[PDB]
Design a protein around this ligand. Structure first.
Ligand SMILES: [Mg+2]
Ligand SMILES: [Zn+2]
Ligand SMILES: [Zn+2]
Ligand SMILES: [Zn+2]
Lengths: 113, 49, 45, 263, 144, 84, 48, 49, 66
RNA sequence: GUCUUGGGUG
């Protein structure tokens, strides 16, 4: 009678953006990103990918409430780099790593036959 | 009936713990939030809302 | 009129609000209505 | 740089060691295979005649929990993205179940093999309840006695395990790393000695135990991950793994798409 | 009268403190601690005199007054709803009229469903009481 | 007769918690009834917060009449009582 | 708590509860804390 | 009823003035009230019924 | 009542194993060995089958009401 | 819609 729908976890409404970027003015060259309809799966992956770049100085995420399906991520970079650019770079790098992983798994499965 | 009485505009339900609430916050169910009401005078600062 | 069922001998029949409350095949005392004709949906959740 | 080493590979389970990947990647893969790989499951039940002792929604819950062949479910559309008002084949598979005790002695068992596929987006290989063998009887659904009857028309749709556990292609994804606790990520409770009182990991012999002269290493991260995916027959283990990888790739591509098209 | 759950004892996320307790949603989805609920409503016809009695019947608005605010569109012609029909709160499940002592000469004595409960009608029973007057029992079903 | 001259007023010069609460409530109710507002309203629209802004700037046009146990009273304007 | 209440006020003291709760709860989420039947068992010499 | 509305919150028996306290509202799914865990001592409350 | 289709904890399909389990118990195999042969290895899956109480047999004894 | 009785919860 107060239970929300089990598909509001992942189905993005039309009035809710998938992604929203605001800058943190306290420290230089930092941005706050809210990811809607996502959870720890994307957040931790992105966080541990970004934490290993030389040009990324701060990166973190939190899920403020478990009953709401979003997370917010703080990411700072050095003077030349833009945190947004580091975010596309991390996404592309993880995509390539998964592609190589898929190719090798398929080859291994074929060899096992 | 005079020193104590039953009153309108009240609610009751089981309590739960929430590590993510502030000290002076209480989490209110949606159904109760819709059953209870507050009368808000219309002014030239709250007419859109 | 509307379909009923016996409680003792499972006989099906139909009474019309003016006959007494009784079963035909045996004459038993308690009868149950029949399932509705509408279609019922469940969410499987 | 990522590497896969399959250790055991049959239809239902695959046991593999994953290496040269971050722990976040491996855990994201485990989570994706548990929660975000689409399957097919009965999502709408229509009762015609149910005179069994079981209730209508009890049987409906059980029918929703039946694994169905989902090989081609990816060529299908989510029933919330199909412009049909009432249901249609682009986004549903229709099954029939008819069961009835004939005679007046013994019990008639109603099994999942008795479900019959009537319509569905052919020639896609979806919808059939999964049988282990040629002689499988399937899952027990109900029991019937004299004159008791069951007449049900089920609809199957595409969904993921986030919405409901019945869409999960996986049962349990065993997952571990660092059998010898070289990284010191855990800190063993003990009474007398922590080495005697704790059983060895089943992959202990896959890695060299630490030498007594060794000192702690502060550069080593987790690098080898031993995981065992099991399925319910709706998808095969290699299919579950590959579609988990693809689902993660497309989630990342969605993020990339929003980022680029926000410029 | 119970189930063997798999229990961990941990301060996992802080939502199990002070006798709270975290439960697996997937295990709930697979049927853990799931139960059926049955509520039965009862009603009968009284005799207020010689030819003055109540009647189970769907009450038409013209001949009746003080009709309940619920919907009457679910009753069959006998004033009884049929098993297999979904029922919400405030819906009428037993229609009854009480005659007005000395047109438009009846008051209603209909039995609604409880304002809190949903469910599906299971078993509409019909018999006669100790004194031979009509007697009805309606059992609802639901899942919690 | 019962009023006290502004010189021999011997009550506290400080706004008490109850006086502050009631003054804020009354000002908020007044402003919510389209009363004129003495402060410059910059960002906030809630009448209670506007009333708090007025209280801090000593611009609430009200008077507290503090009754003594013998029936006499002292009058203090809100702008001359001290707010913590 | 008393010190922060007296020096900083009720608002900052209220926010102190939340800050400490959040930090410690995250750290304990990733550390863990349990109790078992073995935590009530004393060794043989102590039993003697 | 909306977020940040002040509401009086209360557990019986009300043995002292801190058994009745004013809270800011936060509207939420599911049927229980939510409390930060440091306020369960003045209310003498726990979450077992 | 009747054997659940899935294991509550992990979701393995146990609904197709109750009859084989009963036949194994008939021919003398003890419960642990029968559960081993059905390839129920996790104790969650094992307690699904070992603790089931089959009440549908008792419910079926009351005559069909139609 | 009312009064008593009984079984309970924090
Ligand atoms: Mg208590
Ligand atoms: Zn009969
Ligand atoms: Zn369609
Ligand atoms: Zn299990």
């Amino acid at each position: 009678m107060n239970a929300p729908d089990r598909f509001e976890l992942f189905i993005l409404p039309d009035d809710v953006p998938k992604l929203k970027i605001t800058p943190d003015s306290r420290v230089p060259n930092c941005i706050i990103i809210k990811f809607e309809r996502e959870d720890h799966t994307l957040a931790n992956l992105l966080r541990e990918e970004l934490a290993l770049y030389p040009d990324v100085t701060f990166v973190a995420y939190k899920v403020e409430h478990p009953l709401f399906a979003n997370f917010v991520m703080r990411l700072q970079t050095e003077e030349g780099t833009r945190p947004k650019q580091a975010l596309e770079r991390a996404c592309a790098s993880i995509i390539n790593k998964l592609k190589t992983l898929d190719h090798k798994f398929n080859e291994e499965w074929n060899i096992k036959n | 009936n005079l020193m104590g009485k039953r009153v309108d505009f009240s609610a009751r339900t089981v309590i739960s713990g929430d590590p993510n609430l502030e000290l002076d916050q209480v989490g209110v169910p949606i159904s109760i939030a819709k059953t209870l009401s507050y009368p808000e005078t219309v002014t030239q600062y709250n007419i859109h809302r | 009129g509307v379909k009923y069922t016996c409680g003792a001998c499972a006989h099906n029949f139909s009474l019309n609000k003016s006959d007494p409350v009784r079963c035909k095949e045996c004459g038993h005392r308690v009868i149950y209505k029949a399932r509705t004709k509408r279609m019922i949906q469940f969410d499987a959740r | 740089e990522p590497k896969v080493n399959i250790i055991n590979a049959q239809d239902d389970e695959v046991e593999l060691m994953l290496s040269d990947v971050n722990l976040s990647l491996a855990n994201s893969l485990r989570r994706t295979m548990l929660a975000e790989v689409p399957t097919l499951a009965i999502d709408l039940v229509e009762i015609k005649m149910n005179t069994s002792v079981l209730a209508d929604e009890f049987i409906s819950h059980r029918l929703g929990l039946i694994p169905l062949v989902s090989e081609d479910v990816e060529e299908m559309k989510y029933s919330r993205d199909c412009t049909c008002e009432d249901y249609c084949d682009e986004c549903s598979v229709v099954l029939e179940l008819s069961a009835r005790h004939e005679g007046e002695e013994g019990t008639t068992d109603v099994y999942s093999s008795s479900l019959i596929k009537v319509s569905g987006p052919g020639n896609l290989n979806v919808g059939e309840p999964v049988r282990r063998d040629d002689y499988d009887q399937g899952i027990l659904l109900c029991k019937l006695r004299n004159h008791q009857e069951l007449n049900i028309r089920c609809i199957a749709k595409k969904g993921i395990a986030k919405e409901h556990a019945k869409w999960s292609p996986c049962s349990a994804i065993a997952f571990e790393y660092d059998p010898h606790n070289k990284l010191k990520h855990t800190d063993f409770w003990f009474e007398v000695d922590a080495k005697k009182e704790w059983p060895d990991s089943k992959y202990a012999t896959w890695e060299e135990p630490p030498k007594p002269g060794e000192v702690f290493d502060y550069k080593a991260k987790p690098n080898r991950f031993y995981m065992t995916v099991e399925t319910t027959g709706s998808l095969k283990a290699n299919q579950v793994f590959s579609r988990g990888i693809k689902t993660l790739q497309e989630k990342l591509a969605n993020v990339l798409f929003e980022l680029e098209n926000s410029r | 009268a119970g189930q063997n759950a798999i229990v961990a004892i941990a301060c996992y996320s802080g939502y199990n403190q002070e006798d709270s307790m975290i439960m697996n949603q997937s295990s709930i989805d697979r049927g853990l601690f799931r139960s059926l609920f049955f509520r039965s409503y009862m009603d009968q016809e009284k005799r207020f005199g010689i030819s003055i009695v109540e009647e189970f019947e769907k009450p038409t608005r013209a001949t009746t007054l003080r009709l309940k605010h619920g919907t009457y569109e679910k009753l069959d012609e006998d004033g009884l709803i049929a098993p297999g029909v979904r029922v919400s709160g405030d819906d009428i499940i037993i229609g009854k009229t009480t005659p007005i002592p000395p047109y438009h000469t009846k008051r209603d004595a209909s039995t609604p469903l409880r304002s809190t409960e949903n469910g599906i009608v299971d078993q509409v029973l019909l018999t006669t009481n100790q004194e031979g007057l009509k007697f009805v029992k309606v059992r609802m079903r639901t899942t919690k | 007769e019962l009023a006290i001259l502004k010189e021999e007023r011997t009550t506290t010069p400080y706004l008490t918690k109850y006086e502050r609460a009631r003054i804020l409530g009354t000002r908020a109710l007044q402003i919510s009834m389209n009363a004129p507002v003495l402060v410059d309203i910059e960002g906030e629209t809630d009448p209670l917060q506007i009333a708090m802004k007025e209280l801090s700037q000593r611009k609430i046009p009200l008077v507290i009449r503090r009754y003594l146990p013998d029936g006499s009273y002292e009058d203090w304007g809100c702008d001359e009582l001290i707010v913590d | 708590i008393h010190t922060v209440m007296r020096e900083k006020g009720p608002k900052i003291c209220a926010e102190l509860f939340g800050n400490i709760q959040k930090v410690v709860n995250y750290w304990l989420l990733h550390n863990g804390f349990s109790i078992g039947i073995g935590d009530a068992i004393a060794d043989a010499s102590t039993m003697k | 009823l909306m977020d940040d509305d002040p509401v009086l919150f209360n557990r019986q028996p009300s043995l002292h003035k801190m058994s009745m306290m004013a809270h800011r509202v936060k509207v939420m799914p599911y049927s229980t009230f939510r409390l930060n865990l440091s306020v369960t001592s003045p209310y003498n409350a726990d979450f077992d019924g | 009542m009747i054997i659940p289709v899935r294991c509550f904890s992990c979701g393995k399909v146990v609904g197709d194993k109750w009859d084989a389990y009963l036949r194994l118990l008939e021919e003398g195999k003890q419960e642990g060995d029968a559960l081993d042969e059905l390839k129920l290895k996790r104790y969650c899956c094992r307690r699904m089958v070992l603790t089931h109480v089959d009440l549908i047999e008792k419910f079926l004894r009351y005559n069909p009401l139609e």
